[PDB]
Design a protein around this nucleic acid. Structure first.
Ligand SMILES: [Mg+2]
Lengths: 79, 1327, 49, 542
DNA sequence: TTTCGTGCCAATTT
DNA sequence: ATTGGCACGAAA
């Protein structure tokens, strides 16, 4: 019988790097939201306001999302 | 008299028994079988003719038209074997069959010939066998293995009381046709005969008899002897035959002529029978009680009433006797059914049988064959006729008919292919006779009951299988009336026949990739006999008896060459001198002994014929005239061996090596080895890998040359001549004028195979072994293939070995190897791997092989040429790009971001992906060959044009050589004609070669035109494109070559079953050394010798030491220049050693140059040949050691390399032949931390090709449970295999230095729950 | 983990409760298995009332 | 997602078996629905219902009823029942056993220098096996600031990652397993030692529990992850914890072969050896004399030996006395712990004697001294077996001089019985039994003569007389010490092979009278193949 | 009308 | 091939 193999995509690599990064719970949720909105070419497809809305918490400013995004942008591949 | 190849290096032979029969061609069983299938036969059997005649003529139901077969022809193959292997196609020939369609008329007697149309049609491609007995299916060589199956005929067997609880034997008989249905007869514990058709529900044995139109009276007459009751007006006076009463007890008063020979209660003895015979006592009075159980034979009806008084086969009673007596009857017929000899089985079977007619039996047969449908008379009759009496559904072949007649003790051998009434009656009679006690059952394992089927017969069967389907299609399509226009070309289609042939030659169980480790592997594979396959046995249902060695295997099947494991006893190997009959039975040759002297005439005897004679053993001493010396010769007579007289001998064996196979005949001192270790050595000898340089065994048996030559790995001169040109890749031989064909330039060109990949990813390379200008003869070796040295098989290396323990580094089969062996590259091997890149056609444009990969850097493209292909000779490793390919991605809408990207970085980077071919991780090597296949109509790149130019150059070179030889001859004739006139002494020399003469000029022009035509044809053949596949544009194949060195973990072995693994590579100064400071190469543990009982290795070591001593003497004499006289005197002394050997080497017929060449070839040791059962004795070995100034015992004193002190005991030091097996640690080591998983089970994959993990099976779980390690088992079960969240959490914790886990739930349990729920069962977890 | 369903046009017997040697349907209805199979595969009729 | 499609080259998606069954069921159901809506004649709807029933039966359990439907190449399709049950089903393939991460395998070699608790692991395997630990350790000490930095450092195989690996594999047991795992001793825990190459080094003393030999065997290695797993490996599955067999209580660390041969060779005496008859101050003086070439290892001397015995309260009390012993026994005495008597080594040490010594050491002193004693015994046995230079030659297989006469007498007796049978005095069975008994007696006589000739030798006395002592024949020493070989195998090597049996079981009357030093003719070799192949087939099939 | 035997089917085989 | 359960047929 055939079952197939699991292939690693760009988002899988990004989430693997996120899980091995010393983030907090809120920072990890923001990182998950950011990695979700990444296309095949590696560009962010949504504005940060949409990510902030998707977080669903009213105690987070745009600055924390900016910091998390800057940390993510230094993953492999760079850029 | 020795040939040129053999005269260079003569191997001393210790054999003493003269040879009377040469070793035959080792690949005859394939070539003859395929020739029988292919060649034209005037008779109607043995090949395609038989298949065509067994189907044609094909006639329709209306009978107004039919197809007639005339003849067939095989066309020339398009490509040669080398071309087929290079391209990757099938080496095959087209089949053209000349069919003929006739048209019959109506309302006329018979069939009026209205019209006849004959046409040649194409029936497909038939694969052809090469000169070496192989088939090229898809650029790869394949071997079809012969099958050992059960012969057709009739066989009588029984169950050894196992079926019944009382231990009663129930005999049975089985009729097996070659094509049809089987027929079984069997008994029961109640002694009733029963019949069985196609292994179905049991039926009474009289059902078939009644279906064959036989009445009860006729059956009783056939199966019983009549006894005549004569009513002589008083008490049924009886005519008595004395022999009828043997072994019986009289139940009445027997008196005759007033004398009571036997009284009441007295049993009849032999003396009483003798007295009755002497007196010829006939008339006997019997009482009415004697007929209380006698059974009447026929039917008797009262003349008055006219009705049936009693039916046939029923016991008479007193009332019935009175009724028949009062009806005016005097003659009665009964059956003799004594309980000792003539057992009454048929009568009881008739009693059990319900049917009493001819139609109800057919109805019951039809009901049993096809249940659940109403019976029909016509359907039952048709089924009964087609079961056994139709030529189109039942066939008893010639071998089957011969076996049937021989089993029935008939005289005629030929006959019909269908059963008859007489055959069934005789089978029943023989079974009844066996039941009575006069007969013997058959042995299924006897080689006279087992038959050999080769490739030709299977190909014929598959061709017939296709042809019957073609005939069915023709019958289906011939019903329509269009006879005025249609042609036979469109009447038939060749697709089914070609499909069947290709399926047989490509996907059959007996069609396998040829084992190509060494020539011995190929020879063994081509001579393999298998009991498995379609129509054979299964390894799970075989049993012990079929796997045993039978006496009839003597001289036909090797008893010490079979795989160990599930296939033991089921895969066999042919013997050296074994052949097959015209019926396919194995036979072996013998010398006939006439008038007490062993003659020279050779008779091939089969298993059946062998048992009737007394055959003397090969190891029997004779005289110069051929007389046995011992008066009690050991001989085999009837499957057992015993002592016989000199005058009772009928035959003798022809050789001492006819009982073993080719592989077992290459083991020196085989008679000193145990059978299990001999089997292990034979199995290991054919998996050795060739090394960089071949090395002859230096201790052999004499069979190396036969194996090397009969295997097609070497280049053999087809005709004699002189070496005109020699090179590392080609040899040109100038043929002698006495072997040249008229009107031909006599030259033979041999293009050598250089560094090609085999089926096992090894290296195939040929090296010349001839010099420029030396003479050659037909059959001489010109080039040596892999594992070949001067035309001799060379599988391993000669190593200096000592038998002693060394600090535990040879503990339990471990091997210690010196560093000098590694430094000299004696066991370094070459391995070649192939990679393929395919460019196809997509919907968004085609994929392109190109050098412009936009995302990668400049350096990564440094080893690619202008066409995007790696250079030849580049050193590559894991991740390097071999072929650059891009896959187009297409979108017709350009977003502003995409427009910005195109503007900044160019449009080429966009709308393109990367799908280049890259070297897999862990793979390295050098690019040695690149091949490009392009579809027809597609433009070729630069690389393909270069390859085509390279291919054209060689053809141009060969044609130019032949053309220039012919031109030289023609210009010589021109000069001979021209100087006959103006005798221009210097004008011709000064003038160029332009120069009856007109006829020669015309011949020159015609020769140039013909050679231009040949060159154009070769260019067209080279330029021809390929038909790859639907949607495939181009294919690029790249070959990488790597060299593997020896290292710890590699498997080494000898020829006596002594295998081991290298444990340490020791520096040179640590190895033991002798008084001269010479270290040993390998140290072997002596403790493995006594328990295994393989003593042949010690004798081989001693003999190799002696040979090396002789070689050292020769080399010492060579280093200091001495005259040829002393060298030849010493060599003559060396060759004359031995106790009455059969080899005579006279160096007086050698020239000085030949003697010097022989000495140069003998300066590294003198090779020695010892047959398997005619080898050298210990005294001869000691004499040879004395000749070399070496100790007789074969043991010297050694010193420790680390301390310099002497070992306390002498150590056996010598030379042994060692092999490197194809079990390399480089292919064994594998490790994994994390990787890919299955999509369904989410568990790690298996294998080394993927980054797979090791399986933790049930037994390991049991072992962990027995320890009590619950946490280890739990982490094995969840966080390591199939807990998706647990794997990530465990990895994160490990990276953070926290060695803790959250177990979770396995995913396979959820998969199981879903699968069970899909069956309509509600299974769930609760609480 | 999401399953679907198919609405059969006519009722169909489950083969596990039919062809297992201790036939649950046959033992429950107290009928031979051959008659049950003949009725199920449209080879014979059976009276309901 | 539990029934995925097959994506292959060329864009072909093909189909699966369950998908095909579902498609057939759906097509039949849709056709039946349409026919029922159209009010078709009953003769067609009955056939459609029957086909739907057959399709559902094939989907649920294909082949149970009627004929199983097949695929493209005439093979039955796999149904849900096939997935559930069988050896290839879920239970036995994915639940009771599975493939795991952090595992490897390779060929095994012998490490003679290893301790009982140590194994030899290639560092190339260890780099892959302990990769997350290496990542964590690299991040811990500031060598790498991100996970990708450590990933690239490990990919490049820098010099510091080897030190990191050596630090992280310091105290971390690994599990070695060899298939088939017949008992719980087939998996054991060892401390790794990083080595060069690609083969795993194994301690010789644990080769008996694994039933492993160094002729191509491969082993698998697993890495425990959590603290509980590591402590279970160290405290339960460690090799030093497994010294008694759970089946019967017998030891499983019995020395064999080279160690036994060396210890037997060193603890033997010769009648007149160099250095015989001198008095030594102790074992150290004996070793000093032996290493200087002044005394023989087998010389009989007197040595001052001090030995300790356990008192009533459990304390050790020493006694010193002069003992008549040999140099080799005194040298070996330096290895025995203090709690054993000197009589345990003052003899010729075979396999049984060494096993008894180890068992006594374990019973009297405990576990750790037993492990140390076993390691020292293995080291000394290997060293002195190498130093002895024991070999094997063709002259070691000594043929008795009276074999020919015995064979001739047996032949004369069987000839006389055959002539008497030709005269008709007895039947066939009695003659057959008499011939068998005669040949058995001849074989027994030949074996006795061979063993009598092989087991003794003649030596010159100190005065110049003759003495008879135990032979130093290499084959006899190997057989007598219990290292390799038994009496029957030596009989086959140097005496007649005896009677052979037909494959059914009946004994052939005429025996093989030739040994293995001599050659067997074609007929005898062919006769022996029946028993050889019968044994091999039984071993393969059981 | 009960009771034991015989033929058939289904399970198993690293 | 071998073993065991189940329906069937012949006999007490
Ligand atoms: Mg092994």
């Amino acid at each position: 019988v055939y079952q197939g193999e699991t292939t690693q995509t760009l988002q899988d690599y990004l989430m693997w790097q996120v899980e091995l990064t010393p983030f907090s719970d809120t920072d990890r949720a923001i990182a998950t939201s950011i990695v979700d909105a990444v296309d095949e070419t590696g560009y962010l497809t949504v504005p940060l306001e949409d990510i902030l809305e998707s977080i669903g918490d009213e105690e987070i400013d745009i600055d924390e999302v900016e910091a998390v995004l800057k940390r993510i942008q230094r993953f492999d591949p760079v850029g | 008299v020795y040939s040129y190849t053999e005269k260079k290096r003569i191997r001393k032979d210790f054999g003493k028994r003269p040879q009377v029969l040469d070793v035959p061609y080792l690949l005859s069983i394939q070539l003859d079988s395929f020739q029988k299938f292919i060649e034209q036969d005037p008779e109607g059997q043995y090949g395609l003719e038989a298949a065509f005649r067994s189907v044609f003529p094909i006639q329709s139901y209306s009978g107004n038209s039919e197809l007639q077969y005339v003849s067939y022809r095989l066309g020339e193959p398009v490509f040669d074997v080398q071309e087929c292997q290079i391209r990757g196609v099938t080496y095959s020939a087209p089949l053209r069959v000349k069919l003929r369609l006739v048209i019959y008329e109506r309302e006329a007697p018979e069939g009026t010939v209205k019209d006849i149309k004959e046409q040649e049609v194409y029936m497909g491609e038939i694969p052809l066998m090469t000169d070496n007995g192989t088939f090229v299916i898809n650029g790869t060589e394949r071997v079809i293995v012969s099958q050992l199956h059960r012969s057709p005929g009739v066989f009588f067997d029984s169950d050894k009381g196992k079926t019944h609880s009382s231990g009663k034997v129930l005999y049975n008989a089985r009729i097996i046709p070659y094509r049809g249905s089987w027929l079984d007869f069997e008994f029961d514990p109640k002694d009733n005969l029963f019949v069985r058709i196609d292994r179905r529900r049991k039926l009474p044995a009289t059902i078939i008899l009644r279906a064959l139109n036989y009445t009860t009276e006729q059956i009783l007459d056939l199966f019983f002897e009549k006894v005549i009751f004569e009513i002589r007006d008083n008490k049924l006076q009886m005519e008595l035959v004395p022999e009828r009463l043997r072994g019986e007890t009289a139940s009445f008063d027997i008196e005759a002529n007033g004398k009571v020979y036997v009284e009441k209660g007295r049993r009849i003895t032999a003396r009483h029978i003798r007295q009755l015979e002497k007196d010829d006592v006939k008339l006997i009075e019997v009482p009415v009680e004697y007929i209380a159980g006698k059974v009447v034979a026929k039917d008797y009806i009262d003349e008055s009433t006219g009705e049936l008084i009693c039916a046939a086969n029923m016991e008479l009673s007193l009332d019935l006797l009175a009724k028949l007596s009062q009806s005016g009857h005097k003659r009665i017929e009964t059956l003799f059914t004594n309980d000792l000899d003539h057992g009454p089985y048929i009568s009881e079977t008739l009693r059990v049988d319900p049917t009493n007619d001819r139609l109800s039996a057919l109805v019951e047969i039809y009901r049993m064959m096809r249940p659940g449908e109403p019976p029909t008379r016509e359907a039952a009759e048709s089924l009964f006729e087609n079961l056994f009496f139709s030529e189109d559904r039942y066939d008893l072949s010639a071998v089957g008919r011969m076996k049937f007649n021989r089993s029935l003790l008939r005289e005629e051998i030929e006959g019909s292919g269908i059963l008859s009434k007489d055959d069934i009656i005789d089978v029943m009679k023989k079974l009844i006779d066996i039941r009575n006690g006069k007969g013997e059952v058959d042995d299924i394992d006897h080689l006279g009951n087992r038959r050999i089927r080769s490739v030709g017969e299977m190909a014929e069967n598959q061709f017939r299988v296709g042809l019957v389907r073609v005939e069915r299609a023709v019958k289906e399509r011939l019903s329509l009336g269009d006879l005025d226009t249609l042609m036979p070309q469109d009447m038939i289609n060749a697709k089914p026949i070609s499909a069947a042939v290709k399926e047989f030659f490509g996907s059959s169980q007996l069609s396998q990739f040829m084992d190509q480790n060494n020539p011995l592997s190929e020879i063994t594979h081509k001579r393999r006999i298998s009991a498995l396959g379609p129509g054979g046995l299964t390894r799970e249902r075989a049993g012990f008896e079929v796997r045993d060695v039978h006496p009839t295997h003597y001289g036909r099947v090797c008893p010490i060459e079979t795989p160990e494991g599930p296939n033991i006893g089921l895969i066999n190997s042919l013997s050296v001198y074994a052949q097959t009959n015209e019926y396919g039975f194995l036979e072996t040759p013998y010398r006939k002994v006439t008038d007490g002297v062993v003659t020279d005439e050779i008779h091939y005897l089969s298993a059946i014929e062998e048992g009737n004679y007394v055959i003397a053993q090969a190891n029997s001493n004779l005289d110069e005239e051929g007389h046995f010396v011992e008066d009690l010769v050991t001989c085999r007579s009837k499957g057992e061996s015993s002592l016989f007289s000199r005058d009772q001998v009928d035959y003798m064996d022809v050789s001492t090596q006819q009982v073993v196979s080719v592989g077992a005949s290459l083991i020196p001192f085989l008679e000193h080895d145990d059978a299990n270790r001999a089997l292990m050595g034979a199995n290991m000898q054919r998996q050795a890998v060739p090394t960089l340089r071949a090395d002859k065994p230096l201790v052999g048996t004499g069979m190396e040359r036969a194996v090397a030559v009969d295997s097609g790995v070497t280049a053999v001169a087809k005709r004699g001549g002189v070496v005109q040109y020699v090179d590392a890749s080609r040899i040109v031989i100038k043929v002698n004028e006495d072997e040249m064909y008229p009107g031909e330039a006599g030259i033979d060109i041999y293009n050598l195979t250089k560094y090609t990949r085999s089926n096992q990813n090894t290296c195939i390379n040929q090296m010349p072994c001839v010099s420029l200008g030396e003479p050659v003869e037909r059959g001489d070796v010109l080039a040596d293939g892999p594992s070949t040295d001067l035309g001799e098989l060379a599988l391993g290396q000669n190593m200096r070995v000592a038998f002693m323990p060394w600090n535990g580094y040879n503990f339990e089969d471990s091997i210690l190897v010196s560093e000098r062996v590694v430094q000299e590259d004696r066991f370094t091997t070459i391995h070649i791997q192939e990679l393929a890149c395919v460019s196809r056609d997509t919907k968004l444009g085609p994929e392109e092989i190109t050098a412009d990969i936009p995302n990668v850097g400049e350096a990564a493209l440094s080893k690619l040429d202008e066409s995007g292909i790696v250079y030849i000779g580049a050193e590559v490793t894991g991740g390097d790009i071999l072929v650059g390919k891009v896959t187009p991605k297409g979108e017709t809408q350009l977003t502003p971001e995409e427009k910005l990207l195109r503007a900044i970085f160019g449009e080429k980077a966009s709308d393109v992906k990367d799908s280049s071919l890259r070297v897999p991780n862990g793979v390295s090597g050098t690019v040695i060959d690149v091949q490009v296949f392009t579809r027809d109509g597609v433009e070729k790149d630069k690389r393909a044009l270069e390859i085509e130019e390279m291919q054209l150059k060689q053809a141009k070179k060969d044609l130019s050589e032949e053309l220039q030889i012919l031109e030289a001859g023609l210009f010589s004739r021109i000069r001979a004609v021209l100087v006959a006139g103006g005798v221009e002494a210097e004008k011709l020399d000064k003038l160029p070669r332009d120069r009856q003469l007109e006829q020669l000029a015309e011949q020159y022009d015609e020769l140039k035109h013909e050679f231009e035509k040949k060159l154009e044809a070769k260019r067209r053949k080279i330029t021809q494109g390929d038909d790859l596949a639907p949607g495939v544009l181009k294919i690029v194949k790249v070959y990488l070559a790597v060299k593997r060195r020896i290292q710890p973990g590699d498997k080494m072995a000898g020829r006596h079953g002594n295998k081991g693994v290298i444990s340490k590579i020791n520096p040179i100064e640590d190895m033991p050394y002798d008084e001269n400071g010479t270290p040993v190469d390998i140290v072997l543990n002596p403790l493995g010798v006594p328990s295994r009982m393989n003593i042949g290795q010690i004798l081989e070591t001693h003999l190799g030491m002696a040979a090396k001593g002789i070689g050292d003497k020769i080399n010492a004499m060579l280093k200091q220049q001495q005259e040829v006289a002393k060298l030849r005197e010493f060599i003559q002394r060396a060759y004359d050693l031995g106790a009455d050997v059969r080899q005579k080497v006279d160096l007086s017929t050698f020239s000085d140059e030949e003697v010097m060449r022989l000495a140069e070839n003998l300066r590294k040791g003198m090779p020695i040949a010892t047959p398997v059962f005619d080898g050298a004795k210990e005294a001869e070995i000691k004499e040879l050691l004395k000749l070399g100034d070496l100790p007789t015992s074969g043991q010297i004193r050694l010193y420790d390399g680390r301390t310099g002190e002497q070992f306390e005991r002498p150590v056996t030091v010598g030379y042994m032949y060692m092999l490197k097996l194809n079990h390399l640690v480089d292919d064994k080591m594998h490790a994994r931390s994390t990787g890919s998983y299955s999509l369904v089970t989410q568990q790690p994959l298996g294998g080394k090709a993927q980054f797979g993990g090791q399986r933790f099976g049930e037994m390991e779980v049991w072992a962990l449970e027995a320890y009590g390690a619950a946490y280890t088992l739990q982490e094995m079960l969840t966080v390591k295999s199939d807990d998706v969240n647990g794997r990530t959490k465990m990895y994160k914790n490990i990276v953070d230095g926290n060695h803790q886990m959250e177990p979770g739930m396995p995913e396979s349990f959820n998969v199981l729950l879903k699968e069970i729920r899909s069956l309509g069962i509600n299974i769930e977890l609760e609480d | 983990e999401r399953m679907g369903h198919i609405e059969l046009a006519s009722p169909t017997a489950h083969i596990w409760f039919l062809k297992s040697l201790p036939s649950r349907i046959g033992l429950l209805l107290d009928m031979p298995l051959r008659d049950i199979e003949r009725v199920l595969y449209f080879e014979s009729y059976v009276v309901i009332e | 997602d539990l029934r995925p499609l097959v994506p292959l080259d060329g864009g072909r998606f093909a189909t699966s078996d369950l998908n095909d069954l579902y498609r057939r069921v759906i097509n039949r159901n849709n056709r039946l629905k349409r026919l029922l809506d159209l009010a078709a004649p009953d003769i067609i709807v009955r056939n459609e219902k029957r086909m739907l029933q057959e399709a559902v039966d094939a989907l649920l359990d294909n082949g149970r009823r009627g004929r199983a439907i097949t695929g493209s190449n005439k093979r039955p399709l796999k149904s849900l029942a096939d997935m559930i049950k069988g050896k290839q089903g879920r239970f036995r393939q994915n639940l009771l056993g599975k493939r795991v991460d952090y595992s490897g395998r390779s060929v095994i070699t012998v490490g003679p220098y290893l301790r009982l608790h140590q194994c030899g692991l290639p560092k190339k395997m260890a780099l892959e096996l302990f990769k997350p630990f290496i990542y964590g350790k690299l991040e811990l000490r500031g060598l790498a600031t991100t996970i990708k930095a450590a990933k690239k450092m490990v990919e490049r195989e820098e010099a510091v990652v080897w030190d990191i690996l050596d630090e992280v594999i310091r105290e971390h047991p690994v599990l070695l397993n060899r298939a088939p795992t017949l008992h719980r001793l087939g998996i054991q825990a060892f401390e790794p030692v990083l080595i060069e190459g690609k083969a795993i080094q194994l301690h010789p003393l644990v080769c008996a529990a694994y039933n492993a030999d160094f002729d191509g065997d491969q082993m698998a290695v697993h890495v425990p992850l959590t603290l509980e797993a590591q402590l279970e490996a160290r405290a339960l599955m460690m090799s030093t914890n497994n010294i008694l067999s759970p089946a019967n209580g017998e030891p499983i660390i019995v020395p064999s072969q080279d160690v036994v041969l060396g210890l037997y060779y060193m603890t033997r005496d010769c009648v007149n050896a160099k250095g015989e008859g001198m008095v030594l101050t102790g074992p150290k003086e004996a070793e000093r004399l032996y290493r200087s070439g002044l005394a023989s290892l087998h010389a009989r001397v007197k040595v001052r030996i001090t030995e300790y015995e356990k008192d009533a309260n459990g304390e050790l009390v020493a006694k010193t006395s002069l003992k008549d012993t040999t140099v080799g026994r005194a040298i070996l005495w330096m290895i025995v712990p203090k709690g054993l008597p000197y009589s345990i080594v003052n003899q010729a040490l075979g396999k049984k004697a060494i096993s008894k010594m180890l068992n006594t050491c374990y019973r009297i002193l405990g576990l750790k001294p037993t492990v140390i004693f076993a390691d020292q015994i293995m080291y000394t046995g290997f060293a002195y077996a190498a130093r002895s230079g024991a070999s094997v030659g063709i002259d070691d297989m000594v043929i008795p001089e009276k074999k020919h006469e015995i064979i001739s007498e047996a032949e004369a007796e069987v000839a006389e019985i055959q002539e008497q049978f030709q005269s008709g005095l007895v039947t066939a069975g009695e003659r057959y039994n008499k011939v068998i008994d005669i040949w058995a007696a001849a074989n027994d006589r030949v074996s006795k003569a061979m063993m009598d000739n092989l087991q003794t030798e003649t030596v010159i006395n100190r005065d110049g007389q003759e003495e008879k002592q135990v032979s130093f024949n290499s084959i006899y020493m190997m057989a007598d010490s219990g290292a390799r070989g038994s009496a029957a195998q030596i009989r086959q090597l140097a005496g007649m092979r005896g009677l052979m049996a037909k494959p059914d079981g009946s004994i052939i009357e005429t025996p093989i009278t030739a040994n293995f030093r001599e050659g067997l003719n074609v007929l005898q070799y062919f006769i022996s193949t029946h028993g050889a192949r019968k044994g091999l087939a039984d071993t393969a099939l059981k």
